[PDB]
Amino acid sequence: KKGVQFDDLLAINSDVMAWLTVKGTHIDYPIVQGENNLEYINKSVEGEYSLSGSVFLDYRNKVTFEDKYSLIYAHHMAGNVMFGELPNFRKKSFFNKHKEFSIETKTKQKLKINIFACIQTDAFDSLLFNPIDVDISSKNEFLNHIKQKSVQYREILTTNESRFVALSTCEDMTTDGRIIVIGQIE
Ligand SMILES: [Cl-]
Ligand SMILES: [Cl-]
Ligand SMILES: [Zn+2]
Ligand SMILES: [Zn+2]
Ligand SMILES: [Zn+2]
Ligand SMILES: [Zn+2]
Ligand SMILES: [Zn+2]
Ligand SMILES: [Zn+2]
Ligand SMILES: [Zn+2]
Ligand SMILES: [Zn+2]
């Protein structure tokens, strides 16, 4: 719970930079950003060694969620431990029922994200694991790339100023499989 832990985590590890909540799941966690994307494989939010590691914002993103595309990722262990419910978004009824997640930043800014796709892709997706590549792609290539890999999708109003947030980890039942749940910042 955020009220007991967030400030203290923030005080303990300057890598701590947001809190993530996804209604309909037990995803309700502090988020770190590392200096690279391997740092939190075997490191906890408190900054110590860990067998499961942590969920992390891509090192190339702005902590303020100002970028076009903010990628929140978990490696294999942390994904199984913390993001085990993401594949529920593959289910029609689940996807139609749970439509948002929210983030609170370290300056206590509150963001609401509107979910529009659940994606099945793999570790070698040419677009979605690089926020820089996304930033320099057109909105239409981004949305069509996503569309063709989506198991669930919904059309929502977008502008060219729209920002996106993706949550992702592995899906160990398919080859090099990755799941992505993506939304648009309210
Ligand atoms: Cl990857
Ligand atoms: Cl874009
Ligand atoms: Zn940093
Ligand atoms: Zn539910
Ligand atoms: Zn660090
Ligand atoms: Zn990994
Ligand atoms: Zn895995
Ligand atoms: Zn607060
Ligand atoms: Zn593509
Ligand atoms: Zn709205």
Author numbering: 52 to 237
What are the paper's exact sentences on this?
Here, we focus on Spy0129, an accessory sortase responsible for assembly of the covalent polymeric shaft of the pili expressed by Streptococcus pyogenes (group A streptococcus; GAS) serotype M1. Spy0129 is the only pilus-specific sortase of GAS M1, having been shown by gene knockout to be essential for the polymerization of Spy0128. In this process, Spy0129 cleaves between Thr and Gly of the sortase-recognition motif EVPTG of Spy0128, and links the Thr carboxylate via an isopeptide bond to the ε-amino group of Lys161 of the next major pilin subunit. The overall structure of Spy0129 conforms to the archetypal sortase fold, in which a highly-twisted, 8-stranded β-sheet folds over to generate a core β-barrel, whose surface is decorated with loops and helices.
The Spy0129 structure solved in this study comprises the complete 237-residue polypeptide, with the exception of the first 35 residues, which constitute the transmembrane anchor and were omitted from the construct (Spy012936–237) to permit soluble expression. Spy0129 was crystallized in the space group I4122, with two molecules in the asymmetric unit. Crystals could only be obtained in the presence of 0.2 M Zn2+ and the asymmetric unit was found to contain 19 bound Zn2+ ions, which were used to derive initial phases by single wavelength anomalous diffraction (SAD) methods. The structure was subsequently refined at 2.3 Å resolution (R = 20.4%, Rfree = 26.0%; see Table 1 for full details). The most distinctive features of the Spy0129 structure, however, are the three long connecting loops β2/β3 (residues 86–105), β4/β5 (residues 126–150) and β6/β7 (residues 173–214), which between them shape the presumed substrate-binding region. Distinct differences are seen in the active sites of the two independent Spy0129 molecules in the crystal. Alternative positions of these loops are stabilised by bound zinc ions that coordinate the active site residues in different ways in the two molecules, and by crystal packing. Structural superpositions, however, show that in molecule B of Spy0129 the conformations of β4 and the β4/β5 loop match the equivalent structures of all other sortases, and that His126 superimposes on the catalytic histidine in each case. In this molecule, His126 is directed towards Cys221, with a bound zinc ion bridging between Cys221 Sγ and His126 Nδ1, whereas His127 projects into solution. We conclude that the bound Zn2+ ions in the crystal structure are probably not of functional importance, although they do play a role in stabilising alternate conformations of several loops and in stabilising the crystal packing.
